[model samples]
Target: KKRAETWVQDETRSLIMFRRGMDGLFNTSKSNKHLWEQISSKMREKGFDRSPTMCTDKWRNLLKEFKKAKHHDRGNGSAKMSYYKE
Candidate 1:
């Protein structure tokens, strides 16, 4: 058979660290390509060999979940990362 995992329960340490710096980086970007270059380089520093596309895709997925939670959240939303946990 098979098993389902709540991978979204926690994005990796590397991803969390990358996200922390992304606000500034995204502000300077004209498009997604700019984000990939910046994030992929950061991933490399953490010993990850993923391509820019890989990093961008993962970020996109996480963002969707974050946005959904934001939408469902009532006033005074905390936006806790765990909001998306399964």
Candidate 2:
């Protein structure tokens, strides 16, 4: 609440878990905005200070990064991208 703090590994990982836990609650409509607010509150309950927008922004970035990483490692010989999968 003091400044624009960055997310640590644990915070980011927890965010992933929280989002994944609520997978079926997401949708393509603008009416789905409250789902993120709920997710943010869950993060707060875990002691992380993040807003709905921030959590969503980080999630979008994570997806893109995961896909990029997955693309470069796209081969049957390796499967390091497993951690990023659902």
Candidate 3:
């Protein structure tokens, strides 16, 4: 049942790396409906049927984690400074 956590980890790492390169999945990009379709198709090539909605959730989760860890980032991308922990 847990045969692929390693694979999942590696996959997630790359996805996150991609996310960082894309400015942490900037809200502007996520706002684009077509971006999801593009991401969905590319991921489809890997046999994972994850949806764009799920991708967005994952991105949000990552940002929360960064916040909890007290990351240097406060209001990257389209976020307002008030959104950060003070």
Candidate closest to the true structure, highest lDDT: 2
TM-score per candidate, chains pooled? 0.55, 0.69, 0.51
What overall lDDT goes with each candidate model? 0.64, 0.81, 0.61
List residue ranges in candidate 2 displaced over 4 A.
Answer: 1-5, 27-30, 71-86
Descending-TM-score candidate ranking: 2, 1, 3
Tens-digit lDDT string for candidate 3 (1-86): 22534336755665565556655455655565666456656665777666677766776777877766645757446445575677
Please provide, for model 2 over 1-86, each residue's C-alpha lDDT reduced to its tens digit, 9 standing for 90 to 100.
12345878899899999888786677544465888899999899989988899999989988887766635554756646666667
Summarize candidate 1's per-residue lDDT along 1-86 as a digit string, tens digits.
22345333233557656766785666776665776688778777767676777666767776777665545456855547664567
Q: Candidate 3's C-alpha lDDT? A: 0.61
Clash pairs, candidate 2, are none
- For model 1, which pairs clash? none
> Where in model 3 is the C-alpha error above 4 Å?
1-7, 24-30, 70-86
Assess candidate 1 and give its TM-score to the true structure.
Answer: 0.55
TM-score of 3: 0.51
Residue 6, model 2: lDDT of: 81
- Best-fitting candidate, measured by TM-score? 2
**Candidate 2 worst ten-residue window by lDDT:** 70-79
